Structures are given as C-alpha cells and as structure tokens.
Design a protein around this ligand. Structure first.
Ligand SMILES: O=C(O)Cc1cccc(O)c1
Length: 167
C-alpha cells in the first residue's frame, strides 16, 4: 500500500490522474517526483518551471551547481537531485523536444530511467511544451516502465482523451 489517492489504474503498474503535479507532490511527498527537464536543467516553463517555482528557486540553484560540475545531460538521460519541499528526490528526465527537432525514438530511452525507481510520481514525458503527442507518450510509458508510476495530467480535457483512447 502507498499514499497515492484517486488514480485510475491503466495496467498492472501504471496509474493516471487529472492533477497538478506540484499540488500532488506537496500533498503526497513521494520518494521520487519526475521533472520534465532539459539537458541544461534550465527550469523555465512547464512542469520544471512550475516545480522549480514551488521550491522557491532552490531546484534551479542546485541544478546550476550540478551542470557547472558535470555538464549537460543527454537527451534521453536523467540525474537524481534533491526533491526539496516536494519529494525525497527529483529524477530530472530529458525527453526529446519535438519543437527543437529531437528524435522521438529517444522517448523510450527517457522512460527507461523510471525503471531505476520502484515508485514515481511523473508527468507524461515530451508532452506539453516539448511538443510530442501525449497519447503516444502514454503508450511508450506503458510499454517501457515496469516500476509503479503515478502519472499526473494537468489538463482535464487531455486526461479524459487519454483515458477514453487507452488501448
Ligand atoms: O499534464 C498535461 O496535461 C500535459 C502536459 C503538460 C505539460 C507538461 C507535460 O509533460 C504534460
């Protein structure tokens, strides 16, 4: 048993809910929250702008130190940093950004990072301002992630479409 409430079960291991991932993280304080990161960990907008704002910019301060030491992530890659006031840990995962010309095949590599963690609160990778088809992102998630993933979908209209079209 875990602390996640109100999710629809899609598969053995994948759950979904219409929720603000910021508000969900603040309520649950999961072990791992996933950020929709870019390779520079520049948390300007979307989930990383919203997650970073909720940390009062402490996520960005930590991230800048990480990049100064290690250099940029790979598209498809990840790093584990603090979860600040939102979670124990934040898994910063870089899905391909379609609006920058990145290979959508890298979305499966991105979701493979989730398998290193037994339970996660996550957004749909490469959705929203990263420009991918969210229906596709949910299919890749279901067919790639084997650990227990709790997906927060901000947009109620998209949530209903994801559920109603799910095979
Ligand atoms: O949550 C959503 O409704 C779709 C979305 C919006 C912003 C970033 C995402 O990964 C996904």
């Amino acid at each position: 048993v875990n602390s996640f409430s109100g999710y629809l079960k899609l598969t053995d291991n994948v759950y979904i809910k219409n929720a603000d991932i910021v508000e969900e993280a603040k309520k649950v304080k999961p072990t791992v929250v996933v950020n929709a990161a870019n390779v520079y960990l520049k948390h300007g907008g979307g989930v990383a702008g919203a997650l970073n704002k909720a940390t009062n910019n402490a996520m960005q301060v930590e991230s800048d130190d990480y990049i100064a030491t290690n250099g940029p992530l790979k598209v498809g890659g990840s790093c584990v940093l603090s979860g600040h006031n939102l979670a124990k840990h934040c898994l910063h995962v870089v899905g391909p950004n379609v609006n920058k010309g990145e290979d959508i095949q890298l979305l499966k590599s991105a979701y493979e990072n989730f398998n290193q963690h037994e339970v996660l609160l996550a957004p749909l990778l490469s959705a929203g301002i990263f420009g991918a088809d969210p229906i596709h992102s949910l299919r890749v998630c279901v067919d790639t992630v084997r650990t227990n993933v709790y997906l927060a979908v901000f947009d109620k209209n998209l949530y209903d479409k994801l559920v109603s079209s799910f095979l």
